[PDB]
Swiss-Prot record, chain A:
This is Thiol:disulfide interchange protein DsbA. One of its GO terms (cellular component) is periplasmic space. InterPro entries: DSBA-like_thioredoxin_dom, DsbA/DsbL, Thiol_disulfide_DsbA, Thioredoxin-like_sf, Thioredoxin_CS, Thioredoxin_domain. PANTHER family: THIOL:DISULFIDE INTERCHANGE PROTEIN DSBA, THIOL:DISULFIDE INTERCHANGE PROTEIN DSBL. Keywords: Disulfide bond, Periplasm, Redox-active center, Signal. PROSITE patterns: THIOREDOXIN_1, THIOREDOXIN_2. Involved in disulfide-bond formation. Acts by transferring its disulfide bond to other proteins. Residues 1-138 form the Thioredoxin domain. The keyword Flavoprotein does not apply. It is found in: Periplasm.
Curated annotation (Swiss-Prot), chain B:
SUPFAM superfamilies: Thioredoxin-like. Involved in disulfide-bond formation. Acts by transferring its disulfide bond to other proteins. The gene is dsbA. PANTHER family: THIOL:DISULFIDE INTERCHANGE PROTEIN DSBA, THIOL:DISULFIDE INTERCHANGE PROTEIN DSBL. Keywords: Disulfide bond, Periplasm, Redox-active center, Signal. CDD domains: DsbA_DsbA. Residues 1-139 form the Thioredoxin domain. Belongs to the thioredoxin family. DsbA subfamily. This is Thiol:disulfide interchange protein DsbA. It is found in: Periplasm. GO terms for molecular function: disulfide oxidoreductase activity. Disulfide bonds join 31-34.
Length: 181, 182, 179
């Protein structure tokens, strides 16, 4: 087995388009996801026009579920600008945004109404998205974070792409040209 | 391209080598990425700037990794730096489980190290002291993953912040998009 | 980009050809994984390029596998080389000792006594020594590893990362601080 990914069987559903969907499974607590967030955002700006990026928050343990809720609350609140902010506050600023109370405090700090945040954070719509989220994470057999799902048929990750067999031969080829000269 | 590249370290860390700009590589023997980059770091150090010194610092994100910190300093104390890179090979290629003193000592003895000597140095206060300092250094630099580099006590960079995933997963994602379009 | 220099560079014993060495171990699942690709690659390589596969041993327990490699080549049964990988990793056959190895070869048309004699021949012993010597000179730390022109070393793991980039940042940061 030399491939740098695995097939998702049975394949996952679509998003009614003709758009190749890419899913980035992340977690606000994951330093790797934090480090890569700006790369992913930048990548999305130049992605092929028939491709859509969907970032899905995951929870490997009960304590992570609130991080999922947070993600959706920010989206429903129409403040996607705060999304990358959560990473920075957590990883760069060392802020303990691990429970509703703490998150809400930070949310208000960013200009959000606590009352609205509170209600939206508990909304049945958010609770559903979270289910769907972990649900997708399960259908993808997520090994960790970050993890990527493509077209619902392929799943890859930093670890799965670690060994580049064909790549090594390709480098060997470059080296040959280098020593010949 | 979207890659942070590095981050500032605050407060800045003063060099522990008078007259030298320090480059600290935080690593762990159990880390696949550290094992993979070791020969490149070593090669890199051979041509490094004269006013620069490289130091390798074993980190521990949990207690169970502490023995691995102790191992790094013990080999240096025993003056067998030659075994340092071999540790990576043993764990990652020979799949030897050197995660405890007993397993380590056995391995050490297999490499011509006197078991009694190893067992002794491993618990030396010198080693214990350096292990404490390693973790304090890792903390001051807010290291959250390996490998990681602290430069001039002012910056912290890592392959991940430098865009390492563009050669891996992200490269595979672009390739997977093409394949699903087929 | 993703490669390490071999210091000092190894002398060439193939004038007029760029030598590529693949350090492998039959027990290595990654070497098993890439073997098919390496052979395909060899068929189309540049005419002034030559590939040599070198069995490596990190511990004593791995020497028999080196012996096996040179024994199959001495028996002129290169066809059995790729089969060792699949036999071990796909078929799960425990080909880890001369006896198990001889038996396995016997079922492939090889004269069992000829296998046993070549396996312990002075000739095979010499080549196993040279291999270990080459491994030491190239400072090989894992498998599979590729040495090119006796000067460079790269591998699947390095090719799957941008460690050189990470270090370049370090270089620039060194300059930044010194200011």
């Amino acid at each position: 087995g030399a491939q740098q990914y695995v097939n998702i069987n049975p394949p996952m559903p679509s998003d009614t388009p003709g758009k190749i969907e890419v899913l980035e499974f992340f977690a606000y607590t994951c330093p790797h996801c934090a480090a890569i967030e700006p790369m992913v955002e930048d990548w999305a700006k130049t992605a092929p026009q028939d491709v859509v990026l969907k970032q899905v928050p995951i929870a490997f343990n009960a304590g992570m579920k609130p991080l999922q809720q947070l993600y959706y609350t920010l989206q429903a609140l129409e403040r996607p600008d705060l999304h990358p902010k959560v990473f920075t506050a957590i990883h760069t600023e060392r802020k303990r945004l691990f429970d509703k109370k703490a998150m809400g405090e930070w949310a208000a700090s960013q200009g959000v109404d606590r009352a609205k945040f509170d209600s939206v954070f508990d909304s049945f719509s958010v609770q559903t998205q979270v289910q769907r989220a972990s649900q997708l994470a399960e259908a993808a057999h997520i090994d960790g974070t970050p993890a990527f799902a493509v077209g619902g048929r392929y799943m890859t990750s930093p670890v799965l792409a670690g060994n580049d067999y064909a790549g090594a031969l390709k480098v060997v080829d470059q080296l040959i040209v280098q020593s010949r000269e």
